[PDB]
Amino acid sequence: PVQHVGGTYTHIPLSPRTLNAWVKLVEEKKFGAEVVPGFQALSEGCTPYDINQMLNCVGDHQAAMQIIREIINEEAAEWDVQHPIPAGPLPAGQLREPRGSDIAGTTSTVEEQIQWMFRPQNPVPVGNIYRRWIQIGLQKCVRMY
Amino acid sequence: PVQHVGGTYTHIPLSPRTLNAWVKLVEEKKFGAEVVPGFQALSEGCTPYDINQMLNCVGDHQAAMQIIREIINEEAAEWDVQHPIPAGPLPAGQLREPRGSDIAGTTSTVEEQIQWMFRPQNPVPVGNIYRRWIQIGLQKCVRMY
């Protein structure tokens, strides 16, 4: 999550209580139907950095990471297909529009993620887009497990 | 739940995201299959006070609340019958053994609940015994809804 203190938006991590709650939620029936709303509530206000921490937390469930990974690449490829990258201009020292991999938090830092989410000039809610990609992945975990 | 810092055992509330997760879980299929797994998992480590915080969140489902009330009542009564307590509640100074409603958090404080759970000479798992009564209620709500 993110918090504003003196014209400065800053990262605050998910508390251990919450990460711990999510792990429990997941291990309870092993991707039971409950993980989907559970995840939507526990990831409210999150940056991609924070969602990747949530997933790292259950990473010993390799079979679900793989289902989730597959959809992330599926949705990130689609994203790139629907967000070309325009032929400049873009000024050295100025932050790129995000690609499907910046949204997933693979090629971007938490700080860049906060800059897209809260910039006044067409923010891009990268954390909320990513959550949509994970949800679909979670829904598949539930149907294939 | 309970944090152990400084040889003194202290209440740590459920994180707000945990509580919202509970609600989403409940309101997802209106007391659907998930609430029981969801309950078990998110209620881990709680005092009855916390279990009651969870319940106050979904308090506007009076119908399920009522089903839960019957159960707590059935169970709190059999607790009292199976722990006679002699004529006539003397008492003393040292904290009373829990009655059916100290377990339900009605006639007790979190400090008192933490006191039963952690005292070294015969602890009493009040949070968990109470979890057990809320699951039977929830199991009933799923059957009844």
Dig out the tokens for B31 from the structure. Answer: 């007391």
Dig out the tokens for B91 from the structure. Answer: 């008492």
| Dist. CA B75–CA B101, nearest whole Å | 10
Give me the DSSP letters along A89-121. ---TTSPPPPPHHHHTTSSS-HHHHHHHHH-SS
Neighbours of A28 (CB within 10 A): 21
- Rounded alpha-carbon distances, angstroms, from residue B12 to A17, B51, B83: 9, 13, 30
**Domains of chain B, residue spans:** 1-145
Sign of the torsion formed by the C-alpha atoms of B74, B77, B79 and B81: negative
Encoded amino acid at A66, one letter: Q
CATH of A1-145, one of 3.40.50.2300, 3.30.1300.10, 1.10.375.10, 1.10.3210.10: 1.10.375.10
Neighbours of A78 (CB within 10 A): 12
Indicate yes or no: CB of B41 within 8 angstroms of CB of A34. yes
Method: X-ray
Measure B25 CA to nearest chain A CA, in Å: 6
Count CB pairs under 8 A between chains A and B: 67
3-class secondary structure, B95: coil
In the numeric block, the tokens 């400065």 are attached to: A8
Give me the DSSP letters along A51-62. HHHHHHTTTT-H
Task: Determine the straight-line distance between the first and last CA of chain A, rounded to whole angstroms.
Answer: 30
Give CA angle at A24 (A48, B34), nearest 5°: 100
| Dist. CA A127–CA B128, nearest whole Å | 36
| Dist. CA A11–CA B80, nearest whole Å | 50
Give CA angle at A69 (A35, A139), nearest 5°: 30
Indicate yes or no: CB of B21 within 8 angstroms of CB of A24. no
3-class secondary structure, B19: helix
Closest by CA position to A39, among listed A64, A63, A74, A2: A64
Chain A residues 44-73 within an 8 A CB cutoff of chain B: 44
| Dist. CA B27–CA A134, nearest whole Å | 21
